[PDB]
Enzyme design. Sequence first.
Site, PDB file in Angstrom:
ATOM      1  N   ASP A 166       0.161  -7.357  -1.695  1.00  0.00           N
ATOM      2  CA  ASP A 166       0.631  -6.430  -2.735  1.00  0.00           C
ATOM      3  C   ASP A 166      -0.239  -5.185  -2.832  1.00  0.00           C
ATOM      4  OD1 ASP A 166       2.603  -6.485  -5.207  1.00  0.00           O
ATOM      5  OD2 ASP A 166       0.749  -5.593  -5.942  1.00  0.00           O
ATOM      6  N   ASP A 201       3.960   0.497  -2.399  1.00  0.00           N
ATOM      7  CA  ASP A 201       3.808  -0.861  -2.931  1.00  0.00           C
ATOM      8  C   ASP A 201       4.574  -1.856  -2.076  1.00  0.00           C
ATOM      9  OD1 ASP A 201       3.433  -3.239  -4.414  1.00  0.00           O
ATOM     10  OD2 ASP A 201       4.719  -2.608  -6.058  1.00  0.00           O
TER      11      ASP A 201
END
Length: 371
Positions: free
Chosen positions: A36, A219
């Site tokens: 992440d 992201d």
Amino acid sequence: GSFVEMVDNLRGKSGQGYYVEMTVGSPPQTLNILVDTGSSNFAVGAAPHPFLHRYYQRQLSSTYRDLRKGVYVPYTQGAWAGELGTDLVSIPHGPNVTVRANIAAITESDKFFINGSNWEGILGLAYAEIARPDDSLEPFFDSLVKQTHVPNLFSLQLCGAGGSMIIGGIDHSLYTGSLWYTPIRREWYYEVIIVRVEINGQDLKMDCKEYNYDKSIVDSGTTNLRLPKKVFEAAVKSIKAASSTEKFPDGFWLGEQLVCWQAGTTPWNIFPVISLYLMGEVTNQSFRITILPQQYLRPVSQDDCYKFAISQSSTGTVMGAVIMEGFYVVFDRARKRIGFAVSACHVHDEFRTAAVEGPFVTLDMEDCGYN
Ligand SMILES: C[C@@H](NC(=O)c1cc(COC(=O)[C@](C)(N)Cc2ccccc2)cc(N(C)S(C)(=O)=O)c1)c1ccc(F)cc1
């Protein structure tokens, strides 16, 4: 290549998040961890949960050190609560090192874990500024670089319908053509600057300040390409116009409705390519990345169902897996820049391919960023 043992270290494919194996504590406890880049906390499920196959058992780890402090992390999607501590951490198919890292033991969560995703924790790869409870909680990668000689750089190849996380360098088997770099504007999120948007070569003709309103971030833990409301709306009108050889319900473009085709019949050719121009490393220089419908139409018997994976955001642009699956993406933290090249594994057809092209001349690019 010398990074060969890190190649193919990611799994996902079910389309619910790309994860790497990480080994925590002593004796070893190995868990699947979401990669992440939109956050800065390392956290693992540490109690039973209906969606978890395994979890971290701190009592069983002799090297675990409880920090005697709670942590709560709410995201754009989902939230969790847990206990802070540190423990030994390694990545069996990453760098050949072991570090003592901050670890949040997740005891309680809401809409965070995903049923059938096969991941049990999250590795937040962004900077300390956005860490919870605050920026004094050193993120995992910061610990890695402080404690070892691993170069301050990682790169990601997400392969859509697993992939590779190369830590400490770049593997040339993972991409074709050249790598093109955009500056990291500020070290909190992985913030970048988008300077122009085209749909099938047609400029969207919005002020570039709208593209980065609030911010534009990369992201790996977000599914979609998420765009500010005003940008999203213009993009949808343009995409509709360019794909008007067939019509779709309004809710399709909103992610509310899926369209399915008989297996192997999806008319990719009727959908436009989408180009984002990013600020380059030299004055007035930009480059563009170009994605195909194979990236922005995500698959959900004899029927191939797809969701339109461009959506609106109220917190700025998010370049999620829709973008990343087209490209080998280099998070060159040491030089404060992110590189993009055509991925050796990106999904395409015989007529079109994802592209990274440049250079282009774009003036006043500094104006495009939000203050
Ligand atoms: C994990 C999972 N991610 C998601 O499902 C997802 C995640 C976020 C917010 O994501 C975030 O806030 C963080 C920073 N990535 C943290 C996180 C929250 C929840 C779950 C995992 C990680 C937003 C959205 N959207 C609101 S959307 C539909 O516009 O993309 C979808 C995923 C990631 C990559 C993939 F290729 C496939 C699934």
